[PDB]
Design a protein around this ligand. Structure first.
Ligand SMILES: CC(C)(C)NC(=O)[C@@H]1CN(Cc2cccnc2)CCN1C[C@@H](O)C[C@@H](Cc1ccccc1)C(=O)N[C@H]1c2ccccc2C[C@H]1O
Lengths: 116, 116
């Protein structure tokens, strides 16, 4: 679908996320062309799930803390799609619970940005 | 133009920014559907320009020293376009000199996100 861009209304979407550690869950995620990589909430995971450490570039510079990588791929299903997005790895937000569909996922559903 | 979304290649654009505090300059800016507001480098301004202090949520926790608000509106022109995007106010990166075109600007050029 064509998704209008509005400063007052974030372009969010329902996404079923399978972290392969528990049952697939539906979240509301921000469609973010400015994001190199997808971010999912730590709440999607179980308590015994191992994650890799990392340091990501953010608005406050380097955040050497609340972002981790999954060891296993992450599967994401959009409402109008049966076939899933399969990310080799993606970021996990451990402080807050940000949900961000990055260009890694957007490429897989062949999404484009269009300026008239 | 149609801009493909690619985790390895950021959707950037060359945009002429008029801060109305110095001569208009062309910068490279990230096209970002996840940004509520536009960010421009403080380099485009003069040393005597008054700016407002504020608080902006970003990846690296929560910052309130990084970004400032403009006092005057900002005009942005896209390639081969004479009629300017007019932003009443936008963020000013006083540190890493980021250039981000948010949904405030993307709305005025009628930009859309398209998922096939
Ligand atoms: C993979 C990861 C997500 C960590 N990457 C980023 O953070 C990139 C980095 N570049 C770095 C970069 C900068 C310049 C050139 N190349 C790379 C700048 C662009 N961001 C993506 C941002 O668009 C992320 C969003 C996320 C968000 C939205 C709403 C609420 C919380 C978090 C974001 O930061 N948006 C905020 C935001 C951001 C800018 C301006 C205003 C606002 C308001 C707010 O919406």
């Amino acid at each position: 679908p064509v998704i209008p861009l509005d400063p007052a209304r974030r372009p969010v979407i329902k996404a079923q996320v399978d972290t392969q550690t528990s049952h697939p869950k539906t979240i509301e995620a921000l469609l973010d062309t400015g994001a190199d990589m997808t971010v999912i909430p730590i709440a999607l995971f179980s308590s015994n799930t191992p994650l890799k450490n990392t340091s990501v570039l953010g608005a406050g510079g380097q955040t050497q803390d609340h972002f981790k990588l999954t060891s296993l791929p992450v599967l994401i299903r959009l409402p109008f799609r049966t076939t899933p997005i399969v990310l080799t790895s993606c970021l996990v937000d451990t402080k807050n619970n940000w949900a961000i569909i990055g260009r890694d996922a957007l490429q897989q559903c062949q999404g484009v940005l269009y300026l008239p």
